[PDB]
Amino acid sequence: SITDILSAEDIAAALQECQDPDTFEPQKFFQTSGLSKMSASQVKDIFRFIDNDQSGYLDGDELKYFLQKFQSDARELTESETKSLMDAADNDGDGKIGADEFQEMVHS
């Protein structure tokens, strides 16, 4: 979902740095460790971190399930955590985070 092409250690720190239900559990994981200096392609694999697609794209509602996808026992990114994901790409006019949208953030 990310380890395809990324620094494994930096991931933990990247994630574990400020992680919490309101700081940036996914974005930090990606950015600090991986996204910071990665091409668009690998982002495809990274993108897989959050939701897979569900119906063509990921959305603020579903974003909480990203953990419930594999861990099927997540906390549901609380009210705040999904903000991270929401703010991850299509936040200003779609509230959805798709691979393309996600790629846009790193490319931004």
Side-chain angles (χ1 to χ4, degrees):
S1 58
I2 293 189
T3 59
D4 184 71
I5 321 158
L6 238 100
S7 304
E9 296 295 84
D10 292 275
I11 267 170
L15 200 201
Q16 294 15 314
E17 181 45 272
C18 199
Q19 174 194 39
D20 267 294
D22 167 285
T23 177
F24 269 125
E25 313 188 27
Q27 297 290 92
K28 285 260 187 184
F29 183 120
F30 326 149
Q31 198 91 150
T32 297
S33 184
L35 253 47
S36 174
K37 325 178 306 93
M38 304 271 170
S39 300
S41 296
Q42 63 85 260
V43 193
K44 283 155 50 178
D45 235 278
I46 279 87
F47 151 74
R48 304 311 186 82
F49 191 89
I50 59 180
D51 284 44
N52 193 330
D53 50 84
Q54 322 175 99
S55 184
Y57 356 86
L58 307 322
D59 190 280
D61 313 272
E62 289 304 279
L63 296 190
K64 304 177 279 290
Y65 306 168
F66 79 136
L67 273 170
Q68 272 190 30
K69 297 296 162 172
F70 104 100
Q71 196 211 265
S72 48
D73 290 270
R75 34 69 204 297
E76 309 170 275
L77 287 180
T78 74
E79 302 182 81
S80 204
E81 226 309 81
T82 57
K83 182 187 304 178
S84 293
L85 290 190
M86 298 241 59
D87 299 32
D90 234 297
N91 19 92
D92 180 89
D94 203 304
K96 113 302 225 307
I97 310 301
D100 186 84
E101 262 28 271
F102 184 114
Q103 304 227 329
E104 108 159 279
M105 209 59 180
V106 53
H107 179 265
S108 178

